[PDB]
């Protein structure tokens, strides 16, 4: 009876190449709380910070994983989530429009 | 809405990996101000808001974090005890991991007095027992939960919790509202704009963005010809910017040339009036 | 300021 995580990957401000910014991976609606959330730069784990575990009215958990970053034309970013509800890692690409 | 003080307790068992991990966080409205983690080397209540690290604590209540630390350690111990007995109530083996969550605190009314109290529990992510708004009676979700309800009725634990709500809870919420006034007694209206994303010869995406708003509650929708379109569109879950504000967007797929049929609608407590706007 | 339940489940 696990609940699957939902994931948004987004910059704090609209992305401009060479301009400093913040990369977010927001993951919510999941149960139980144990979870692995990585922000990846061109497939490699970035150094990140993770919010303190909290939960919503429906008892589902939410976490923010974030770091400062400077987007470029040559770099692709994603968020990798592993959870007991999933057989494989859920991969979500950062798309500057989301 | 009314100002609220909320604590969220999470405990998870880890069979063959020692004691349960207990995590506590406290919030005023949508702003976190404290944390506790039983797995930290020297677990104590730590501040998680700049206004909880201002001179006032050291100058007027220097034992503030020590009291919270003491209360959090107690809660950690109670929750260990709760996971053990729940395993018994549900006839579950030592081998599987389980979770217990508690949310409690107070909504502040205009009278500077309690408006509503909460004290509610989930086991493995489902309602277990809640204190009802009357603050004298309990809702139990199953047979197991009736055991606790009878236990708590007999000890008069309701009366005990009321004493906390009408005493510490509202008094401390008012202290936090005062000392964190700049942060907490504020409503940052959303800034909204519309963007334009071709998809196909038959579809253009119109995305209505709301940025930099506080608190998190918002209404964000599209109308076509003044008819609500919640039923067609993509509405993302409200998300944190990471700087203490929130973000959202709503996207419709529209026939190219039909863009001027669509209006985006934004409602938020910070707005003198609802916003209406369109693609450029 | 938090509280802890005087009794367990």
Numbering used by the authors:
A (entry chain B): 1 to 98
B (entry chain A): 1 to 280
C (entry chain C): 1 to 9
Paper quotes:
The MHC-I molecule plays a crucial role in antiviral immunity by presenting antigenic peptides to activate specific CD8+ T cells to clear virus-infected cells, while its downregulation can activate NK cells and trigger inflammatory responses. Bats possess distinctive characteristic in their MHC-I molecule, with prevalent 3- or 5-amino acid (3AA or 5AA) insertions at the N-terminal end of the peptide binding groove (PBG), which may generate a unique antiviral immune response. To explore the influence of the 5AA insertion on the structure and function of bat MHC-I, we focused on Mylu-B*67:01. Mylu-B*67:01 contains the most common 5AA insertion sequence, MQQPW, and also exhibits the D61/R67 pairing.
To explore this hypothesis, the COVID-19 P1 peptide was mutated at the P1-F position, generating P1-T and P1-E mutants that were more compatible with the P1 residue preference of Mylu-B*67:01ΔMQQPW. The insertion of MQQPW brings D61 closer to R67, but the salt bridge network is only formed in the presence of P1-E. The salt bridge network induced by P1-E makes a significant shift in the minor helix formed by MQQPW. The interactions between P1-E and 61D/67 R is similar to that of Ptal-N*01:01 with an inserted MDL. From the surface pattern, the change in the position of 61D allows it to participate in the formation of the A pocket and to form a salt bridge network with P1-E via 67 R. The P1-E mutant peptide was less thermally stable with Mylu-B*67:01 compared to the original P1-F peptide, suggesting that the acidic residues are not the only preference for the P1 position. The MQQPW insertion introduces a new small helix and pushes D61 closer to R67, allowing them to form a salt bridge network with the P1 acidic residue of the bound peptide.
